[PDB]
Amino acid sequence: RRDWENPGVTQLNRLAAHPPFASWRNSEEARTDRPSQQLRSLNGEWRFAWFPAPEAVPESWLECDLPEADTVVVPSNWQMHGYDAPIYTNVTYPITVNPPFVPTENPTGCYSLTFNVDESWLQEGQTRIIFDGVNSAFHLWCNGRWVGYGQDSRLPSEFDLSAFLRAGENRLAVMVLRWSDGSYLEDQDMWRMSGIFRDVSLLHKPTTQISDFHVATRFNDDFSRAVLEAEVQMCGELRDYLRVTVSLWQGETQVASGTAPFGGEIIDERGGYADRVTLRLNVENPKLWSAEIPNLYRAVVELHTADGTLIEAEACDVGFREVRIENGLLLLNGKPLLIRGVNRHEHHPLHGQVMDEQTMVQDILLMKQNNFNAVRCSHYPNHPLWYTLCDRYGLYVVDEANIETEGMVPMNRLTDDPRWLPAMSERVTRMVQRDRNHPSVIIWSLGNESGHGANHDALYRWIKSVDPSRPVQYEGGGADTTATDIICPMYARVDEDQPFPAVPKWSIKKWLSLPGETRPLILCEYAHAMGNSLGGFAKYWQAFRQYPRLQGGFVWDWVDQSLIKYDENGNPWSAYGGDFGDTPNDRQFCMNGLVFADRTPHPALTEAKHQQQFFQFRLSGQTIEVTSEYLFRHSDNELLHWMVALDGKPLASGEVPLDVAPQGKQLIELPELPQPESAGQLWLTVRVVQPNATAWSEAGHISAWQQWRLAENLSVTLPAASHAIPHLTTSEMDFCIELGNKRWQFNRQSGFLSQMWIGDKKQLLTPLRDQFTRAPLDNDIGVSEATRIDPNAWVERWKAAGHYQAEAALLQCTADTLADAVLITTAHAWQHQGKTLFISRKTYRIDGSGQMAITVDVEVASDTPHPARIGLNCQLAQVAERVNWLGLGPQENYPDRLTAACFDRWDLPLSDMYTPYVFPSENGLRCGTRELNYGPHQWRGDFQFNISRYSQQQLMETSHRHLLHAEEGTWLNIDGFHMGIGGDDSWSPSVSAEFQLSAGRYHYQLVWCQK
Amino acid sequence: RRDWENPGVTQLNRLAAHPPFASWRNSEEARTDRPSQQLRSLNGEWRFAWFPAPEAVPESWLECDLPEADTVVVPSNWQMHGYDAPIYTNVTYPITVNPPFVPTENPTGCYSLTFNVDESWLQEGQTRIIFDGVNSAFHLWCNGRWVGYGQDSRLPSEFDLSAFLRAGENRLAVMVLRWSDGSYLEDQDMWRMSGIFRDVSLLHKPTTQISDFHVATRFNDDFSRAVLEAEVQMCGELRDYLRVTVSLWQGETQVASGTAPFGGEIIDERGGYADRVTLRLNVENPKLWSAEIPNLYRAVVELHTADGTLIEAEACDVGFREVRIENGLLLLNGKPLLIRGVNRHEHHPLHGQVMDEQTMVQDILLMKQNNFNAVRCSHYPNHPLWYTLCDRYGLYVVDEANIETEGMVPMNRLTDDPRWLPAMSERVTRMVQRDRNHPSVIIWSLGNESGHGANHDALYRWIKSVDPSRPVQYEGGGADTTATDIICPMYARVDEDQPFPAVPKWSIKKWLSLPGETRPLILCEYAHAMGNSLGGFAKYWQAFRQYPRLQGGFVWDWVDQSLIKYDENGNPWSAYGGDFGDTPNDRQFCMNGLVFADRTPHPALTEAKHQQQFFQFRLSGQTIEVTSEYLFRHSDNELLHWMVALDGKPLASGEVPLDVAPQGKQLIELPELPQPESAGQLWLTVRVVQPNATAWSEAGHISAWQQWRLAENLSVTLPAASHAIPHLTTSEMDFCIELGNKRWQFNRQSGFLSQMWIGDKKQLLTPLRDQFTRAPLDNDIGVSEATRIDPNAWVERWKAAGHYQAEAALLQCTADTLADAVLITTAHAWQHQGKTLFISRKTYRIDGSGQMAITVDVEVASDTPHPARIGLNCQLAQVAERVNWLGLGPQENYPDRLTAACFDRWDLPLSDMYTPYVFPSENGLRCGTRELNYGPHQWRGDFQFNISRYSQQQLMETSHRHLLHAEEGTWLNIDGFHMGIGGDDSWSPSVSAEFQLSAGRYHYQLVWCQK
């Protein structure tokens, strides 16, 4: 038969899809959502055996346990047990593209389970087994008898076992095929794994039972009244005495209830559905559901007899909310949304694709804490609990069909093919059928990167037709096809067009206004967060706020898909593509998240938090204007704290409770701000604090902040008559400067400050030298590969230009004595294959105070690519415990990614100054720094810096953070200017022009001194 | 695996659908559409054995012939060979409704063929088998090896036998299931048969080949320039040297040609289709296709190498025409269509569902000859040649998916069920893929009577997406759902609404203007031509012509679905529902056509012919205004013949050439018309004659006619005075009147004219009495049945009122004497259970001239159902050869069905005065009769009459025409008034009110005399 190589066969004997069931035989348990005795989990310990192909499976296995099998926990991915390697491939299918066939060599997992079944279950009713997720296809046998077959790794597959079970001990046999015709529709950019990775359970239902139920909530013009309409379908024998009661609960209070016998209205010439009924309940002043306030009711549906005897009850949470597109805007409860979203794959660094509640809750909490209000299920239906959580914690969800065929050529090879219409349609219809009652689901998605074919148009219409309550979106074929209600591109930039043929990515601002275009625009994917990224994130938010039809996006993406590996010592490390022997592979491309696989944040997450704030502020005078971006709630859990500080020193602060209506404003007058005695810049900072803990945050959570510079007083104060004069000692090879117990030495042939002593202690491990490059970020690299260079990537342009191989040539090195000081002058040219790339001119002034003033004037040839940076660097001899600076922080920040950072006095352990991206690179920079303190040293000026135990050299040479090792001393990189990091996408140059070091001539100055 | 009881499996190993291929290896042949050596017929003699269930078939059969098998012709329907009975059921499924299962006793036809295959076929390329039509499902084996499976009885199932054949003799084995899950989608109203009922063929294709091609023709604003676009797809090895050449020919002249290598434009991010290519050819001044003038070009598609070697050629007929709906109208080449359509099932009285080219041609010619320009493929895709003929002869076609699930409850039960989307999808997509290059197809239909389900919306969209060139219609769920571009009701009436719940049938005039409605309206079915029907046909035509958005309709239907049976003496007779022992069944409902199963016309065909005329005329004075309803051609094969006749006495005629541009007028002045010889009504008749023969008509064909009354000179002439005086003889029992050779005998107890003599010859077999009833037509009976009376049917109403059992009561009978005559006066009451239904009052005046003048005044109780007729009747003793009359004719005509008839003197064999409707009823009436002659008799007046060898009693007691027996003498029915026959539908009263005998009081006068 070979069912797994035939798209016309997606399953056999599989029962129809439906909303979550539990078959309660008690209404109150249904109501309270408590555990049902009729729903049993079969998770736990199973028997497993791996085969290289299904043909290698012994027939004996059907009847009894193979001795060689092992005992593993289910759910699980077999790759996570070490049976075979998971594979990380992004676009390229992991198998030869020759649809619908698969390799003969097809890893087959043989699972089995011995278990008991009570006769009461068998004596009456129906017993079905449910597989929440099986990757990628499987055959099912029960007690040596074949039951059925199923495809679609992301939706449950259920089979009736009533006639196969016996009272007592029973044996289940499951054969899971790693590859199948289903794989052709599962080309998502993630680890390719396999097995029974989601829940397995048994459900007992009565013969006469509820087989499906739909809940709808329609509203009046101002949402002050609603009608809850509940359509109920049954299976089993119909009887006049049967009844259906649907009741609606607001907590313990019974809001409404209606009852009726089966038998719907006349549908057509042949009549109506005798086996369905629709109950309609009026609700006055419903408490509306939103991500701001996730008000929910409980709908209980009871199938019972006229005498009042319950047969069974099913139920669901209900959120009263209306989703609609009108006049080009996506409205929720009549208000236009602003999606602060994120795409989130189901990934566990240890369990692979197996999802648990803990994990899910932790994700949600972090999301909420970080001002995210929506998530897109990239790119398949999620584990069922996920929707229950979003419902309850409150997140807007885009539910997406498990359809991705990006590896086809062209992209819509399958989707435009009618022979693939059925398989595809099952991926769409079964999703809708299972998830349609969830209020957190506000938009349906037809899948991802599958081109645009006629199958998508058909499915788009099917959906609109069965569930008019939610818009339908799809990005394939150019982001604005006839199969999408929303213009939902991936990586379209804010102002910059990327006119690819056939599927150009217009600037989002321009897209909205193309001739005849009227739909809302919400990026299904944007701001690719791979490595040190999210450069230019603010640019998106400023546009979203400015343009009404620009309604947000889903950042790509939530968490890094790194897996855990263990070294010889049994120490764990983060592995990516290729690390399991998987090949071909896509290396680090599986790590694009805002958090690390273990949920620790990347620094970009804080930039996201800030841009996504729900309160905007404006300062005028002593007047702060706060404006609420909430659409439904009042700021009833917020207070504004403010503080004024002069150069980090706090002068005043206070607090005012916030009282702002959704969309409203509040003016706050600050109190008389006494002057201040000392030159310096006064800075005002405000933060919004939630005095109370919520279901997703603790008392004291800071939900937003802002800063402004206030008065500044320039120091006009002339220093003081230096106690002594520095002495210059000139030799053939060095200019030596002595002052107190301090010495500086300048090598006359190199032209660099080669050594500095404090007492008889050398302070440097390497001379202080100009530096123009950085260990390349993911964004600098893009797709470039040693074996296949992308000459357009930044990294490649810099290498070729000789930037990383350039050699300093001394053009001049003089020393002069001034009245109270010693002055050294240097000039150096950096050349490559006869071309002058850069010229650096410096002055060093050492005065009687022992401060060393460095002035740097740099020239950059116009025709060379813009450099990654323009600074100096050195390896200090010293290693100190803390880093203290007065600048932007506390976390890592870059030119195009520094809005969330605040100007203050920060102090941290040196380790917090290094960001452990899995794929090492330039990291840990802090910009806008006026003062830096490390050990006895102090540097002052206006610069950006990074300090760590790793040289740029080591970083650029190391592929996994676990292989890095602390060098001797501390590497200090101090930049007059640094290039932005970009992140619009990570496969093409994405650093905005205003962030490129293209001025041609650069000036910076710094004072090094001892503290 | 029981594939036939799973809608999830509709085929196994079947090849993709595609336009007709022939794989010519010679271009000139492809060009002239000559036979191809690569396309061979397997039709002819096969081996066949019948089994009661698939489980009864022996395995031996796979390997060798069953000795018991018979040798039969293929294609055929096995029921047609007497192996089992064909079943005639209309809506109710012939099997228990329990999807997707079917009965265990499932008639199985085991067919086989041993045939030869030449090595040349096998040395290279691909050899596939093609089954054009297998009802309902089948498994296929070749040389004992299983090949695949197929469903959908109306489309070709193709399999690659390449790996299964050997040079020389080969053996196929086909197991055909009568019932399958596919049967659930095949509930059309027609006989339920089975077998390999369409051609079987074998096609050889090279390995590198043309796998599909779509032809599109697009035009400039005025249709003076077109672009022919041909998208070509290949399978097999791509090489740079491959090319596609597409050439377009008009007859023997090459219009254009173009070549390119494969490689289509970039479609998306992954690129384009390397295996496709689109050639675009400019056509200046194309000759446009239409049903008025079916100009065709030939497109030839060559696959070959750049060095010029041909690999293979395919081709098709191309008709340049655009179909579009705009501003509410369906336009063809920019002009609004007026559809003169008919529904046509594939039926042969002998061959059952096997269609041959002779039969098809015959159908087409008759249709064309009767002013039809369009056909609907009710309700499934037709035999391929049908389209080719429609292309070439010129008829607009509606191609419809083989989806009808009427017997479900409610009707959309399967169509709204996503589990059935797949099965449905293949029925729609495979049709389009096969029929999309035929110009004759102007509209696609999603099927028939399957309610309205979400599957419909999806498919509707799919088609819109894949072939934008033609509108999509579908009547289900109410005729105006979102799954149709055209309001296409079935049996909606002209002025009368039928406001059924959920799916009302509004008057079509009212339908167009419902709030918000703007679509065009074309009835998918109207004017149910069952038996003596088509009453009110002209009312649709008047509406069609007056209202622009009323674009016509498809009459139901073309031919009766009667089957031939043989009597004990081998004499053939027309059978219908229940005649094969089939039960349950729908009796005569399978006979609704304009023509008998043998193609002989029923009388209503002429009605349709006249109403559907392409020329409209008006008369003013001596001036005839001819208007053309052609949209495209000038009247270039037309001349007008006119004639003026006085009381059928010709006075003058002439002929004028017609020269009318489409939609234009022509004014023709008739010549001075001399004054006429005497009293009477002059009548003008004009006729459009085509002097030259056409592909579909003979020289001399009359395509249109019309009449007008001209001057009438009333007779003021007082006749010469009887040179005699009738003698009366009063007896207790009788009043006798004598005059020469004649004698009249009037029964004094009955009050009726009981006998008449001429010489010694008695004139009557039964007395002359009033008649108020008719042998009920199909429309009078509707769905009423003995076992399930339908009290609203006119027949029931009459029966229930006692109309058929009413007995005459003599109220009065007197003989009076005048100077010149004898006057007999009578009066009778017809009653039923004390109710006086009708009162008849008359006078008979016999005078010196031998004429018997009869005067009748009838009263009808206001509260009794309106009687079928009001007249007299008698069985004449004579049986004469001819029937001559001055009235409407010559064909049978009724009040609501007489517009096509013409007033003139007619003379037919008495046998032509009987209409052999298979289900016997009142028939043969001729209206507006002023004089009737038969045998020695003459009757004059103004009436309607019928004359035959069958009494009404007999017609009304006989079920099949073949059982009628001529009675002694000749039955005469002379009516003053007669009820219309109706026909809007045949299951509810459909006689319009102006055609009901509701006046309460009626008067009529007849003169009887000797010819």
Ligand SMILES: [Mg+2]
């Ligand atoms: Mg399959």
Ligand SMILES: [Mg+2]
């Ligand atoms: Mg992808």
Ligand SMILES: [Mg+2]
């Ligand atoms: Mg099937």
Ligand SMILES: [Mg+2]
């Ligand atoms: Mg029907």
Ligand code: NA
């Ligand atoms: Na916006």
Ligand code: NA
């Ligand atoms: Na990725």
Ligand code: NA
């Ligand atoms: Na507050």
Ligand code: NA
């Ligand atoms: Na690195």
Ligand code: NA
């Ligand atoms: Na019209």
Ligand code: NA
């Ligand atoms: Na019928």
Ligand code: NA
């Ligand atoms: Na003419």
Ligand code: NA
């Ligand atoms: Na009859």
